[PDB]
Short mmCIF file of C-alpha atoms and ligand atoms in Angstrom, two decimals:
data_model
loop_
_atom_site.label_atom_id
_atom_site.label_comp_id
_atom_site.label_asym_id
_atom_site.label_seq_id
_atom_site.Cartn_x
_atom_site.Cartn_y
_atom_site.Cartn_z
CA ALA A 1 -0.14 0.41 0.32
CA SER A 2 1.87 2.72 -1.36
CA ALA A 3 3.22 5.91 1.07
CA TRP A 4 3.12 8.35 -2.15
CA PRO A 5 0.50 11.03 -0.18
CA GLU A 6 3.43 11.43 2.23
CA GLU A 7 5.75 13.07 0.24
CA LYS A 8 3.95 16.40 1.17
CA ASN A 9 4.72 16.12 3.55
CA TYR A 10 8.47 15.79 3.58
CA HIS A 11 9.19 17.31 0.23
CA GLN A 12 12.12 20.78 0.73
CA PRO A 13 12.50 22.77 -2.40
CA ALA A 14 15.46 23.54 -4.67
CA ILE A 15 16.61 26.59 -3.02
CA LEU A 16 17.59 29.82 -6.79
CA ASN A 17 20.92 31.08 -6.16
CA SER A 18 21.10 35.14 -6.43
CA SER A 19 21.83 34.95 -10.24
CA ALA A 20 18.03 32.65 -9.93
CA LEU A 21 16.87 34.59 -8.49
CA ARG A 22 17.86 38.18 -10.48
CA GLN A 23 17.03 36.39 -13.28
CA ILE A 24 13.07 35.20 -12.32
CA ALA A 25 12.80 39.12 -11.05
CA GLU A 26 13.70 39.87 -14.36
CA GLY A 27 11.81 37.48 -15.77
CA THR A 28 8.55 38.64 -15.55
CA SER A 29 6.45 41.80 -16.72
CA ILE A 30 4.00 44.25 -14.34
CA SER A 31 3.35 46.23 -17.31
CA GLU A 32 2.96 43.08 -19.78
CA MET A 33 0.41 41.60 -16.98
CA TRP A 34 -0.90 44.93 -16.62
CA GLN A 35 -2.37 45.16 -20.60
CA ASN A 36 -2.56 41.35 -21.92
CA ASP A 37 -3.68 39.01 -18.71
CA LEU A 38 -5.51 41.85 -16.08
CA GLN A 39 -7.12 44.47 -18.98
CA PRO A 40 -8.60 41.76 -20.13
CA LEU A 41 -10.95 40.80 -17.15
CA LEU A 42 -11.28 43.77 -15.66
CA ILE A 43 -15.34 43.61 -16.49
CA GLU A 44 -18.49 42.65 -14.60
CA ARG A 45 -17.84 39.31 -14.70
CA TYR A 46 -20.90 37.38 -11.95
CA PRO A 47 -21.95 33.60 -12.87
CA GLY A 48 -23.70 33.47 -15.69
CA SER A 49 -23.41 37.47 -16.69
CA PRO A 50 -21.90 37.05 -20.40
CA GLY A 51 -18.58 38.40 -19.13
CA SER A 52 -18.02 35.73 -17.30
CA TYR A 53 -18.05 34.21 -20.41
CA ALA A 54 -15.74 36.77 -21.77
CA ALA A 55 -13.38 36.51 -19.13
CA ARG A 56 -13.19 32.58 -18.75
CA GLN A 57 -11.85 32.77 -22.78
CA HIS A 58 -9.27 34.57 -21.57
CA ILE A 59 -8.07 32.45 -19.40
CA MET A 60 -8.17 29.25 -21.91
CA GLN A 61 -6.99 31.53 -24.89
CA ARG A 62 -4.37 32.70 -22.41
CA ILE A 63 -2.83 29.30 -21.38
CA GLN A 64 -3.54 27.58 -24.64
CA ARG A 65 -1.26 29.93 -26.54
CA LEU A 66 1.68 29.31 -24.08
CA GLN A 67 4.21 26.53 -24.85
CA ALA A 68 3.82 23.78 -22.11
CA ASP A 69 1.46 21.20 -22.01
CA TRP A 70 -1.48 22.59 -20.10
CA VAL A 71 -4.37 20.17 -20.43
CA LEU A 72 -7.33 23.24 -20.15
CA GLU A 73 -10.84 21.31 -19.11
CA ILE A 74 -14.40 22.92 -17.90
CA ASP A 75 -15.93 22.11 -14.69
CA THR A 76 -19.70 23.02 -15.97
CA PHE A 77 -22.59 21.81 -12.84
CA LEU A 78 -25.78 23.26 -11.91
CA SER A 79 -26.87 24.73 -8.16
CA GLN A 80 -29.28 26.18 -6.52
CA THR A 81 -28.70 28.96 -5.75
CA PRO A 82 -31.27 32.85 -3.94
CA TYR A 83 -32.30 32.75 -7.34
CA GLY A 84 -33.32 29.86 -8.42
CA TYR A 85 -30.40 26.67 -10.41
CA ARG A 86 -28.26 28.72 -11.99
CA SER A 87 -24.01 26.74 -14.20
CA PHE A 88 -21.20 27.91 -12.98
CA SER A 89 -17.56 26.82 -14.57
CA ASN A 90 -14.61 26.45 -12.84
CA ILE A 91 -12.26 26.16 -15.07
CA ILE A 92 -8.78 23.84 -14.48
CA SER A 93 -5.59 24.11 -15.94
CA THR A 94 -3.48 20.45 -15.56
CA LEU A 95 0.85 20.14 -16.23
CA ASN A 96 1.11 16.40 -16.92
CA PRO A 97 -2.50 15.12 -15.22
CA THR A 98 -1.41 11.80 -14.61
CA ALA A 99 0.94 12.75 -11.93
CA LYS A 100 0.67 11.88 -8.86
CA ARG A 101 1.62 14.76 -6.87
CA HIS A 102 0.31 18.52 -7.90
CA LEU A 103 1.24 22.11 -6.37
CA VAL A 104 -2.23 23.82 -6.89
CA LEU A 105 -2.60 27.48 -6.78
CA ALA A 106 -6.04 29.08 -7.00
CA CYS A 107 -8.06 32.07 -6.71
CA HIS A 108 -11.52 33.28 -8.17
CA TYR A 109 -12.36 34.40 -11.14
CA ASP A 110 -16.48 35.55 -11.19
CA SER A 111 -17.11 39.30 -9.79
CA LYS A 112 -19.48 39.21 -6.94
CA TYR A 113 -23.79 40.46 -8.35
CA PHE A 114 -24.62 44.81 -7.86
CA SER A 115 -26.23 46.19 -10.05
CA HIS A 116 -25.40 48.40 -11.07
CA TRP A 117 -25.38 51.92 -9.04
CA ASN A 118 -24.92 55.16 -10.25
CA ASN A 119 -23.31 53.91 -13.69
CA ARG A 120 -20.64 52.44 -11.97
CA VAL A 121 -20.13 48.41 -12.28
CA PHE A 122 -18.33 46.10 -10.02
CA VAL A 123 -14.78 44.72 -11.37
CA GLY A 124 -13.74 43.45 -8.08
CA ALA A 125 -9.99 44.57 -9.08
CA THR A 126 -8.37 42.62 -6.06
CA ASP A 127 -11.09 40.46 -5.78
CA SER A 128 -9.95 39.52 -7.73
CA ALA A 129 -8.79 39.82 -10.60
CA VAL A 130 -5.04 40.69 -10.55
CA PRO A 131 -5.04 37.09 -8.32
CA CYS A 132 -5.66 35.50 -12.18
CA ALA A 133 -3.82 37.78 -14.41
CA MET A 134 -1.01 37.06 -11.58
CA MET A 135 -2.10 33.30 -12.65
CA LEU A 136 -1.60 33.62 -15.98
CA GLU A 137 1.83 36.49 -16.05
CA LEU A 138 2.75 32.89 -13.45
CA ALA A 139 2.69 30.80 -16.62
CA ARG A 140 3.96 32.93 -19.65
CA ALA A 141 6.57 34.25 -17.40
CA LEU A 142 7.72 30.89 -16.21
CA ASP A 143 6.89 28.98 -19.54
CA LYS A 144 10.65 27.72 -20.90
CA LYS A 145 10.78 26.07 -17.05
CA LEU A 146 7.54 24.27 -16.94
CA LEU A 147 7.73 23.27 -20.80
CA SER A 148 10.27 21.71 -19.11
CA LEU A 149 8.01 19.28 -17.28
CA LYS A 150 6.43 17.84 -20.45
CA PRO A 151 9.66 13.98 -8.24
CA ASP A 152 6.79 13.34 -9.44
CA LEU A 153 4.93 16.67 -8.58
CA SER A 154 3.49 18.95 -11.98
CA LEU A 155 1.72 22.30 -11.45
CA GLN A 156 -2.11 22.79 -11.89
CA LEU A 157 -3.44 25.89 -11.97
CA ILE A 158 -7.01 26.58 -10.42
CA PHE A 159 -10.23 29.34 -11.68
CA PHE A 160 -13.16 29.54 -9.26
CA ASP A 161 -16.19 29.81 -10.55
CA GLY A 162 -19.13 31.07 -7.57
CA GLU A 163 -17.26 32.12 -4.99
CA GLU A 164 -19.31 34.78 -4.09
CA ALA A 165 -22.58 35.57 -2.02
CA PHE A 166 -25.08 36.25 -5.03
CA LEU A 167 -27.13 38.15 -1.54
CA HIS A 168 -24.63 38.37 1.23
CA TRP A 169 -22.74 35.76 2.17
CA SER A 170 -23.65 32.32 4.11
CA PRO A 171 -23.40 28.68 3.61
CA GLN A 172 -25.12 27.72 1.70
CA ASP A 173 -24.80 31.48 -0.86
CA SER A 174 -20.96 31.27 -1.64
CA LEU A 175 -18.20 29.25 -2.97
CA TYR A 176 -20.36 27.77 -5.63
CA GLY A 177 -17.46 26.12 -7.60
CA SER A 178 -15.26 25.66 -5.13
CA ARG A 179 -17.69 22.73 -3.11
CA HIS A 180 -18.53 21.32 -6.45
CA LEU A 181 -14.85 21.04 -7.09
CA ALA A 182 -13.28 19.86 -3.51
CA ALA A 183 -16.64 16.91 -2.86
CA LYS A 184 -15.86 16.40 -7.35
CA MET A 185 -11.95 16.06 -6.62
CA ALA A 186 -12.38 14.56 -3.76
CA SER A 187 -14.35 11.36 -5.46
CA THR A 188 -12.35 10.87 -7.81
CA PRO A 189 -9.66 8.09 -7.79
CA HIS A 190 -5.63 8.75 -9.07
CA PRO A 191 -3.45 8.22 -10.10
CA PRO A 192 -6.18 7.16 -12.92
CA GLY A 193 -6.92 3.78 -11.94
CA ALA A 194 -5.84 3.86 -8.37
CA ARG A 195 -7.64 1.30 -5.63
CA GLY A 196 -8.18 4.19 -2.68
CA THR A 197 -6.04 7.66 -3.24
CA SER A 198 -8.04 10.78 -5.07
CA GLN A 199 -6.60 13.57 -6.67
CA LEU A 200 -8.01 15.05 -3.07
CA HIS A 201 -4.77 12.96 -2.13
CA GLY A 202 -3.07 14.40 -5.02
CA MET A 203 -3.14 17.72 -3.73
CA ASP A 204 -0.07 18.34 -2.01
CA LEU A 205 -0.82 22.30 -1.01
CA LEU A 206 -3.49 24.14 -2.14
CA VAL A 207 -1.77 28.00 -2.33
CA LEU A 208 -5.12 30.03 -2.34
CA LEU A 209 -4.12 34.39 -3.93
CA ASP A 210 -7.56 36.29 -3.06
CA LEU A 211 -7.58 40.04 -2.37
CA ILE A 212 -3.83 41.21 -3.38
CA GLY A 213 -3.82 44.45 -5.18
CA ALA A 214 -3.55 46.84 -2.62
CA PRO A 215 -1.24 48.91 -1.09
CA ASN A 216 0.80 47.42 1.76
CA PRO A 217 -1.04 44.24 2.47
CA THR A 218 0.35 41.63 5.65
CA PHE A 219 -0.43 38.04 5.08
CA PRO A 220 -1.15 36.04 7.87
CA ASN A 221 0.49 31.95 8.84
CA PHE A 222 -2.76 30.76 8.91
CA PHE A 223 -1.84 27.07 8.96
CA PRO A 224 -0.02 24.89 11.48
CA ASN A 225 0.50 22.50 8.15
CA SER A 226 1.93 25.33 5.74
CA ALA A 227 3.76 27.21 8.19
CA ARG A 228 6.81 25.74 6.79
CA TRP A 229 5.95 26.73 2.93
CA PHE A 230 4.51 29.72 4.84
CA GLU A 231 8.06 30.41 6.17
CA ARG A 232 9.65 30.29 2.93
CA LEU A 233 7.51 32.79 1.27
CA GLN A 234 9.10 35.02 4.08
CA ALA A 235 12.62 34.14 2.68
CA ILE A 236 12.29 34.64 -0.56
CA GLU A 237 11.26 38.30 0.33
CA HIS A 238 14.10 38.44 2.75
CA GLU A 239 16.68 37.47 -0.06
CA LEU A 240 14.71 38.57 -2.99
CA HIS A 241 13.85 42.06 -0.93
CA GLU A 242 18.49 42.40 -0.26
CA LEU A 243 19.47 41.54 -3.86
CA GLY A 244 17.58 44.85 -4.65
CA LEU A 245 14.71 42.85 -6.57
CA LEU A 246 11.42 44.67 -5.22
CA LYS A 247 10.02 48.00 -5.68
CA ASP A 248 9.55 50.74 -2.56
CA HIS A 249 9.74 48.04 -0.28
CA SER A 250 10.76 47.56 2.55
CA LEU A 251 11.69 44.43 5.57
CA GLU A 252 9.78 46.70 8.47
CA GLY A 253 6.51 47.16 5.89
CA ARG A 254 6.90 43.22 4.57
CA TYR A 255 4.26 41.62 3.67
CA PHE A 256 4.47 37.94 5.01
CA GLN A 257 4.87 38.95 9.17
CA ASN A 258 5.86 36.82 11.92
CA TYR A 259 2.31 36.14 13.45
CA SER A 260 -1.02 34.31 13.33
CA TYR A 261 -4.87 34.28 12.99
CA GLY A 262 -6.39 32.00 14.77
CA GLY A 263 -10.00 32.99 13.10
CA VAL A 264 -11.51 31.43 10.80
CA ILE A 265 -11.69 33.52 6.55
CA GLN A 266 -14.49 31.58 4.16
CA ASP A 267 -13.19 31.46 1.01
CA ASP A 268 -12.88 29.29 -2.33
CA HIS A 269 -9.62 26.83 0.51
CA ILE A 270 -12.72 25.75 2.67
CA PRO A 271 -14.02 22.41 1.06
CA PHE A 272 -10.05 21.95 0.45
CA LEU A 273 -9.44 21.90 4.39
CA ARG A 274 -12.15 20.77 5.43
CA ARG A 275 -10.82 17.56 3.68
CA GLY A 276 -6.97 17.50 4.67
CA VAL A 277 -5.62 19.56 2.23
CA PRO A 278 -2.48 21.63 3.36
CA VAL A 279 -3.78 25.51 2.17
CA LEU A 280 -1.38 28.32 1.84
CA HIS A 281 -3.88 31.33 1.97
CA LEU A 282 -2.74 34.46 0.43
CA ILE A 283 -5.50 37.27 1.71
CA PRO A 284 -4.42 39.85 4.06
CA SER A 285 -5.70 40.37 6.70
CA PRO A 286 -7.19 42.79 7.24
CA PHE A 287 -8.48 43.58 3.52
CA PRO A 288 -8.71 46.19 1.16
CA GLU A 289 -9.95 49.58 1.98
CA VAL A 290 -11.92 49.06 -1.46
CA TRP A 291 -13.07 45.65 -0.49
CA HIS A 292 -17.01 44.95 -1.90
CA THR A 293 -17.28 48.52 -3.05
CA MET A 294 -16.28 50.26 -6.08
CA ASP A 295 -13.80 51.42 -5.62
CA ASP A 296 -12.31 47.68 -5.65
CA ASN A 297 -11.19 49.34 -9.85
CA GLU A 298 -8.39 49.64 -11.72
CA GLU A 299 -7.39 52.87 -10.60
CA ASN A 300 -6.57 51.66 -6.76
CA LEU A 301 -4.00 48.22 -7.45
CA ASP A 302 -0.57 49.03 -6.61
CA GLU A 303 2.18 48.45 -9.36
CA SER A 304 4.29 47.59 -7.23
CA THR A 305 2.94 45.63 -5.36
CA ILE A 306 2.24 43.35 -7.25
CA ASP A 307 5.28 42.82 -9.34
CA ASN A 308 6.92 42.05 -5.94
CA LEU A 309 4.68 39.84 -4.77
CA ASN A 310 4.56 37.92 -8.70
CA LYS A 311 7.99 37.73 -7.72
CA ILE A 312 8.14 36.18 -4.78
CA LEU A 313 5.32 33.80 -5.80
CA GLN A 314 6.62 32.64 -9.09
CA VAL A 315 9.96 31.91 -7.09
CA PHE A 316 8.24 30.19 -4.99
CA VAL A 317 6.77 28.03 -7.87
CA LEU A 318 10.10 26.84 -8.83
CA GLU A 319 11.55 26.44 -5.93
CA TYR A 320 9.17 23.87 -4.99
CA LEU A 321 9.36 22.10 -8.66
CA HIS A 322 13.02 22.25 -8.29
CA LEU A 323 12.71 24.48 -12.11
C1 1BN B 1 -16.75 37.01 5.01
C2 1BN B 1 -16.75 36.54 4.62
C3 1BN B 1 -16.45 36.14 3.73
C4 1BN B 1 -15.65 36.14 2.64
C5 1BN B 1 -15.73 35.42 0.97
N1 1BN B 1 -14.37 36.85 0.50
C6 1BN B 1 -13.21 36.78 0.05
C7 1BN B 1 -13.26 37.48 -1.04
N2 1BN B 1 -14.71 37.71 -1.16
C8 1BN B 1 -15.17 38.54 0.19
C9 1BN B 1 -14.66 37.80 3.21
C10 1BN B 1 -16.21 38.05 5.10
ZN1 ZN B 2 -15.35 39.32 -2.77
#
């Protein structure tokens, strides 16, 4: 009876040296991400809307143009909602579908529903158009390295639909895409043909990005079982800082500080966490001041902060995958 699902417990990163860190810093482009990955998502895109369809097409197209062997899947399903039955579609992009283990990066691509107010429309820039764009920029910036995966471990990206409540958050009105996909993955044998392991056993770590893009974010170290990975993010931020590779950044104002959060923040990681998947929840506390406000827009985003986090996240992923 294989112990492969325990490999994640002993997995260590292959740390990048200074030269490699400089290479990663120079290899990502915040202006290219802004124009090509982010702006097309700064639209109304609540579930079932024309915008949801356009956002999904954009995400798929941006992944499809890459060289790495991404396998795209649209996970479409029905769920009861305050407005009756509706259809939702999660987007899953996977390198090496049959590899037993995957490091998983995720965010939600839907925007919260709000009727138009005084000619303004809610586009959820930090929530979570920026996280979406960061994942797309990561796939682009690391494309050559990821192409080499074509340690039975690879990478998967999940863009959840329906993270937001249609009304105000409640247990049955929220997390539509993640509740559905976690249940589906928990009941799907993995690798193909397995007798007693599921796709969830194959999820090494779920790194969920949410509410990123405002100035001065502070991310708490939420869970003991992923604390060592939170410490790696701290170390990466520190070294990139010391090498002069971050912009408008100080250690006093670092993003990954030494502090935990004992409370529970409901988000897409919940259905996975309650089924035993280790989670690194990259959501800041406190939330952006513009949270769930029409001001959660492009003008209020902090460019250098997002650029800095792109560098940190890309190093984290390469070190995790030994690339
Ligand atoms: C309360 C309840 C649930 C959440 C989750 N959340 C995250 C992004 N938009 C909403 C936040 C506050
Ligand atoms: Zn939200």
